[PDB]
Ligand binder design. Structure first.
Ligand SMILES: [Zn+2]
Ligand SMILES: [Zn+2]
Lengths: 198, 281, 224, 193, 151, 159
């Protein structure tokens, strides 16, 4: 109540990074020149959804330990409001303590977003059956996100770093099976009295 | 980093022989001056000069003032000569006249978002080195960068392509298409909806390009059905099924004929046709 | 005897909850008084000092009936709606829009429409008093209906015109609700700042309608 | 008397969402958008801006130790705190009246339909999707804070709660990164016109 | 032959002795007006819209499905809204939410709090409310009052 | 007043409203509306000032017919039409230089950098097809950007 944990996360891409474009008008405006545009801001910066990555990472790893953590993965599921991901990332009756910012890049599109040419090759003829263009964020591109945790316990730091190593192992964004989105995280943590604006 | 106004110093955020330790601060007498130490600097705010003062023990920065010989005497007799002196609190011409003499003793002066050059030529005209340049100042949200007309050319061409590929000739505006009864349209679009040639994305795209006029729908269905000269590939989704090669072509022809025959039906009529297939629109 | 004619645009929506579940289709002149009363209270004017009294004539705030597309004024009996003599528009329930916030169920009339301002000053001292607050509300904004502090019911004046009054003689059509001891229930309030006193003052009277001799008047009871 | 006017300009630095409250407009948009943004009939986006301020000052001044009541919860304003004098109580009228955060822009430029998912964790695939609508970044909103009978502790508290809004966000979906913004403030004292 | 400009002439640069601003145009012919993209997005929307102008067993079953959350407060409110609308909207509504998508296989009911039991409970919801779609509206009101307090 | 400095050819018809997609420069001069040409000329004029201080004609229908024919024999592929769109969009001297580059018979090899024709043609006529391609693609540079785009998106949509 009197303290907030602040987690300044700086993430740098060790691989091509694709997350999908979300806005319908931006997608349909860039479904002509490219067929898989990446998520952009209107300030032309790349957005990555970060909360679901951490929440999924924590839920798989905590079900692996056998803790009684729920799963908000299946269709129309229920946060039980009693687990440690339910305490951290929220339930339907209570909000999440860890407010997780979007992964905001420090560069714009012409510096990190590149169009591409992805293919589908016939197995017998060894010829390109299909061609489609898709934007990606380059390797070495770096992004920032601030995770702010109100009412901190002892183990929020360890769970958030553990989720970040799981995100490094799996990837973040889309096309994760093709090698996209493999990144590296750096974390600067700081304890905060909530009244520092006064 | 000193910000001139008095004298502000941002390390602790202090603003200007025993030692008070706040940032090691220590006041020597001017005959008073203050020597501040920080990990990034050993600054000296001298104040004015009067003849045998008390210079500190390395004064990395020496922020002095004068309005002439005594300034330079104090510029010497200080062990480990400063990196950069700062000439403040005086008339500009006298500051430059002193400053020429601090350059003659080989010591650098400076008389009182990050900005990035994305430029590339040089000229040695007059006392200063230069390169003439006409350009652009972009003000991104954490940078301010400098570009030339090649970058303006590239974003101008991107804007031209994005604005040309945005408005067609006679869309949403006001013949010789095929004709076929409603029952065969039912049977054909059911059959071409179970196997995936007419899928919900394709019915939806037919709905938008029909709402944008008949000719927009004719153009869309032709460019979906247009077989390429080189690959021999049409922009339909392949039917899921055994269909060997020729009823593939007759089946794409059936999709062509059924959509083109549905074009001259009434807008409410093609709506009552399509929502059984794609509930959205 | 001058006027303050005005076209006020709702920037934010407004809500006034009448009895049994009904909401006002338009802001009433009692609210245009009340808000100007707060305004003068903080502007240190003698209008403020007098606004406690209801029977205070001089400055009279006719209700704020809406302007139609035909540059004219909607008119209302037994018709919970508004019609205009050009007969082009019917302003009514459709404008209500039910808002379900966190635990709050209420309704408001939407914004983007235009409403009349008409303050019939009779003595010129209160005309100057009224000119100062008109040149205040033009600067910032007036807040009509409930939830003023949340932001509901902002009206920007687009036209401050100091027009002149030609009285009316008839024995006429009520633009608002007269208070004759008839059958219309008219409810209002007397919130008293610097006394911590709020009282709901209820009254009966006439609906908004046919009406007939002296008529030395005519901000609940208005007629033209 | 003096009246503080605080012109509040808000540049959004993240997608913004605030759910539509109009029920018939919600069912009007429900066939197209599952989460319609709170719009005007002027077709502009407004955001609730008083309970964010009141909650920000409540939690901050609470953990400072100043005696405030938490108007989250059976919530009942007292009439005694800095919060109840500034923003309001049951009896005593609020000295501060804070506008809705109307954008300077219309809706067909700044609020776009979007896509949100719910992905199964073992099959790694989109189990559910829904169209929530959202406000673009760099869209500038505007309000006026009308403070009456000001103390000296009125500028600092409003900018402190604005900085808490700059770090917590405004509107809804506050934990998935939605609503991270910045504020430009301009204040004036008005006494006589 | 006349020309009218409809874009802001306030936030414009100055360079090379001309006060210039790069701008995107939508030159309209009527006078010859120069509009931005907000007007074109408008007209595109408004031409689109313009074209877009054209008895104890049910108690036991509803008491079961209220606890495993298959029927829910939103479901009670919208099913009662279809019933208050009439009877055709009711059949259309329960047909729409019982409609298992042939592509994905997921029904629009809320999940229970095997697949055979899931299909049996969804069919129980169908026969329950489709039985309730034929009774008198007063009985539907008194049964739906017990579980959803508002409706 | 305001003066438009653009010829209003290439005006489509969106519903009942005639419409032009266009990019330009508001000039507070007569409040002139000036194209990109203006900017290029005034950029180069200020470059010369700063540094100082220290085509054959063919008919439109013949252009469509010849570009049609050269598209069918694949002399003018869509790679060529796309790169010609890049070099015309960059400017006209760049398009002149590019077209002279692809048409220059190299004195050591005797090879033009065009794509060879599909089909049997005599070497004199294959050369005449190359000279025809030089004549049309050079003649295309004399037109504006709008008719060049409208001409070559029938052959390479995306160009
Ligand atoms: Zn849980
Ligand atoms: Zn209190």
């Amino acid at each position: 109540a009197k303290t907030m944990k602040k987690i300044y996360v700086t993430m740098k891409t060790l691989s091509p990074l694709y997350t999908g474009e979300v806005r319908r008008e931006d997608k349909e405006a860039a479904q002509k020149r490219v067929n898989f545009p990446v998520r952009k801001t209107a300030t032309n910066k790349v957005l990555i959804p970060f909360k679901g990555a951490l929440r999924s990472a924590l839920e798989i790893m905590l079900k692996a330990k056998g803790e009684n953590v729920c799963d908000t993965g299946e269709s129309r599921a229920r946060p039980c409001g009693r687990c440690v991901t339910c305490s951290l990332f929220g339930s339907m009756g209570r909000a999440g303590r860890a407010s997780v910012d979007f992964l905001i890049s420090n560069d714009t599109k012409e510096q990190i977003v590149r169009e591409s040419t992805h293919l589908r090759i016939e197995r017998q003829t060894k010829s390109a059956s299909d061609t489609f263009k898709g934007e990606e964020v380059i390797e070495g591109a770096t992004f920032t996100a601030t995770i702010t945790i109100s009412n901190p316990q002892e183990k929020d730091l360890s769970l958030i770093q553990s989720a970040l190593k799981f995100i490094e192992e799996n990837g973040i964004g889309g096309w994760l099976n093709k090698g996209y989105g493999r990144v590296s995280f750096e974390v600067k943590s700081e304890d905060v009295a909530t009244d520092r604006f006064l | 980093m000193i910000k001139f106004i008095a004298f502000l110093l941002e390390t602790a955020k202090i603003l200007i022989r025993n030692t008070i330790e706040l940032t090691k601060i220590t006041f020597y007498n001017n005959s008073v001056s203050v020597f501040i130490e920080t990990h990034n600097g050993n600054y000296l705010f001298s104040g004015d000069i009067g003849y045998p003062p008390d210079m500190p023990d390395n004064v990395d920065y020496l922020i002095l003032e004068s309005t002439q010989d005594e300034l330079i005497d104090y510029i010497e007799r200080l062990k480990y000569t400063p990196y950069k002196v700062f000439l403040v609190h005086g008339e500009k011409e006298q500051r430059e006249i002193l400053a020429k003499r601090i350059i003659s003793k080989k010591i650098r002066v400076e008389l009182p978002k990050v900005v990035l050059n994305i430029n590339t030529n040089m000229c040695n005209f007059a006392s200063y080195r230069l390169m003439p340049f006409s350009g652009f100042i972009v003000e991104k949200d954490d940078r301010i960068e400098i570009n030339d007309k090649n970058w303006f050319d590239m974003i101008w061409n991107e804007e031209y392509n994005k604005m040309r590929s945005q408005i067609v000739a006679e869309d949403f505006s006001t013949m010789a298409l095929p004709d076929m009864s409603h029952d065969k349209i039912i049977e054909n679009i059911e059959y071409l909806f179970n196997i995936k040639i007419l899928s919900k994305n394709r019915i939806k795209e037919f709905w938008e390009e029909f709402c944008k006029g008949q000719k927009a729908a004719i153009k869309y269905i032709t460019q979906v059905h247009r077989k390429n000269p080189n690959t021999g590939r049409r922009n339909w989704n392949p039917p899921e099924g055994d269909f060997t090669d020729n009823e593939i072509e007759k089946l794409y022809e059936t999709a062509y004929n059924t959509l083109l025959s549905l074009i001259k039906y009434d807008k409410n009529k093609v709506y009552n046709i399509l929502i059984n297939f794609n509930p959205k629109l | 005897m001058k006027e303050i004619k005005g076209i006020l645009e709702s920037i934010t929506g407004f809500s006034i909850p009448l009895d049994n579940g009904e909401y006002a289709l338009y802001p009433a002149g009692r609210h245009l008084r009340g808000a100007i009363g707060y305004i003068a209270f903080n502007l240190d004017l003698p209008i403020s000092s007098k606004f406690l009294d209801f029977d205070f004539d001089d400055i009279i705030f006719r209700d704020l009936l809406p302007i139609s597309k035909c540059g004219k004024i909607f008119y209302p009996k037994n018709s919970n709606s508004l019609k205009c003599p050009s007969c082009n528009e019917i302003y009514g329930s459709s404008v209500l829009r039910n808002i379900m916030a966190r635990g709050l169920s209420y309704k408001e009339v939407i914004e983007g429409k235009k409403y009349r301002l008409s303050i019939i000053v009779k003595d010129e001292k209160y005309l100057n008093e009224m000119e100062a607050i008109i040149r205040y509300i033009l600067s910032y904004g007036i807040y009509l209906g409930n939830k003023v502090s949340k932001g509901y019911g902002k009206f920007k004046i687009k036209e401050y015109s100091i027009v002149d009054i030609l009285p009316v003689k008839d024995s006429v059509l009520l633009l608002s609700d007269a208070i004759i001891d008839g059958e219309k229930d008219i409810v209002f309030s007397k919130k008293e700042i610097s006394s911590s006193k709020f009282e709901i003052i209820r009254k009966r009277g006439k609906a908004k309608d046919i009406i007939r001799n002296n008529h030395n008047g005519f901000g609940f009871g208005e007629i033209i």
